[PDB]
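User: quick one, sequence for these tokens?
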């Protein structure tokens, strides 16, 4: 039950915490304002098409 990496801050079923998944029910923000990545809960969508 693993996924792929994200492409931008905001997706969900991707990898944002280094290589750990970050997203279902929540929403990560990888590299904020040209900064770092972090996981927060919110409004987004799965990365897989």
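Assistant:
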């Amino acid at each position: 039950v693993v996924y792929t990496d994200c492409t931008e801050s905001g997706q969900n079923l991707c990898l944002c915490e280094g290589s750990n998944v970050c997203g279902q029910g929540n929403k990560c923000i990888l590299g904020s304002d040209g900064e770092k990545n972090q996981c927060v809960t919110g409004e987004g969508t799965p990365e897989p098409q």
